[PDB]
Design a protein around this nucleic acid. Sequence first.
RNA 1: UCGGCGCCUUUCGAGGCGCCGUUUUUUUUUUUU
Length: 692
Amino acid sequence: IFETYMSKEDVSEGLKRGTLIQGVLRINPKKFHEAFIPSPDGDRDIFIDGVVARNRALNGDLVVVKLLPEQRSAKVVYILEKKHSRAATGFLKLLRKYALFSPSDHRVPRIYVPLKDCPQDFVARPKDYANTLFICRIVDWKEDCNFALGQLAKSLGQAGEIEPETEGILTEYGVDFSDFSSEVLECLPQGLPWTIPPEEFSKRRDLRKDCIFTIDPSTARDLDDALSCKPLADGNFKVGVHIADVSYFVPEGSDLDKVAAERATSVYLVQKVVPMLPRLLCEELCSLNPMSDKLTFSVIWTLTPEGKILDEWFGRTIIRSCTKLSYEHAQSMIESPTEKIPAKELPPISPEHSSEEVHQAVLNLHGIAKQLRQQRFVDGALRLDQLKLAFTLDHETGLPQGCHIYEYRESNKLVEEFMLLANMAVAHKIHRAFPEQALLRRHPPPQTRMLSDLVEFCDQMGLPVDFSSAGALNKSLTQTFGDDKYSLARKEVLTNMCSRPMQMALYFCSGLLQDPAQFRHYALNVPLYTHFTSPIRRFADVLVHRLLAAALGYRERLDMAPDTLQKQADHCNDRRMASKRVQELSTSLFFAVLVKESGPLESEAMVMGILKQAFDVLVLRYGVQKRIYCNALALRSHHFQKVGKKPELTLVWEPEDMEQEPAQQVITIFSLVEVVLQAESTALKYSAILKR
RNA sequence: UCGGCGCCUUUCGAGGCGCCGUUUUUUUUUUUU
């Protein structure tokens, strides 16, 4: 039996007086008996122990708590906002009136389902339904039942496959993967051979004779932006960034606008993509495909060879892109400055231009982008880059064949510098035009509480890093380690440790925050930032397109209050967090399937934590973090000692032959060991075990 | 996250309830998909 909720008037009175504390619940995944909310006063979190103490609140709910008398313990007494999807994936068992549902997630409780929802052959023959995934939605949880009451949605398929588990994590996280109704496709233009209307040749600047190109990955269906560079007659360059004009095709108030607003970010998975607009807009009219006339919104600068701004112009234009490069052709043209590249390895080009113009254009943009990068990192930019893996999937069956490591070459930096310049320029324009309403991004500084713990950790172990600032933090991590096999692994382990206390970046509206100190982006060390570029994938990028066209005098001022923009910003934030979690879980699923169907995988590892009877490794080749126990090891003994706050584990192994003396192994932090990954009898679980 | 012990339900694939002994949760920024 749980405890009943309280009235709304008492909640409001105690929340305005200050006796009750609101906050977002966070639930430990590894152990499900404890939860934490952030304190408003100080840094350290408020403890909520047990399952009874938190009244029917799931992970992510925005709850209202009351502190227990005598780090600080509280109990949930009200729920303002229900932010959890109230859905789960799991298995059904015949415990009569009900049937039991056990979710895979251990934070979701156990669910009673009536036998009308259960299938027709479950009551007598339930043995074939012990490996079959079901989706169940909680509709009611009583105050006297330890089990929620649920409605069974459907049958996914066999557990351990690719598509049942994919649809399970999409439904559990709230991603709407359904189809578009006919009232949404009726707002699209109805002319299949679409052409530019002749009244749009006077309000826009015509750039159909320039050399404009796109650099995007080989597996790309939507192209948002294009670049151009031109050498001037006094040793300067005219650099232009061109973005697809999406807000011309999405009118305000139409059903397309509400549907696009409902799912803010597109979701990218390993095998497919859940879009935000219909296929017609995303892959035909809006996308900047080669040799077609497109309506764009563009920014043009005049830059010195070191990359300093002398002129600036915003405005609506009409372009025609000439080629579509990749991140691999651009790297070839970067790495071959004095030698002509043969036409066999190049994508097709419009006959108006030559490949020499594209070649010298990407060379000049590389020359400017190098100096912009160096100056930005002298000024104090911070960059904690971890390890990401990419898969090769078989075409017919859809199973993974092998994983490799995604490498950040120079062509990924060429684009990243010009996009960072266009975003900061547009942020300055729409902030000085409309101070009351503007959409901007902010990153708070990291938490002082566990930055002090990382400082006292690196005070030991002979590491001279410093965490006083952001540029100091980046220059210290780059200079101390250097380049070596043991050193690069040291860098990876410290990047994983340093990436832990950083906070998360937020969208916000400028009419609610009072001081300009909080408008600052911490990691990039700039005072204003906004996402003007790439609109097809995000909806805040279309809100910024409307604001900038109102500021330039092309239309009337926006009629939205400063609170409506804040509500839309909160929706875009939660959609971007759920999308990020979904992509991480999809990569983890495909790796577990690869380990099971590719035998044992042999690699090296670096210890990053040591406990009394177990230790955590980080597999260097794959980047996954697994825990190793001594019980699965054929060893005579192991001893744990603490020497100068530097733990030590000594393993005395068992000799295969009695005559040969038993070897010894000493394990401390930053030690290189060898591990093997082996699948086990459960469908999607594996383990890592030490070798020799 | 477990280690040990006791009990119950199994189609042997394992689950669930207690008693001790452990250990208080944060994985972020950038660009293109």
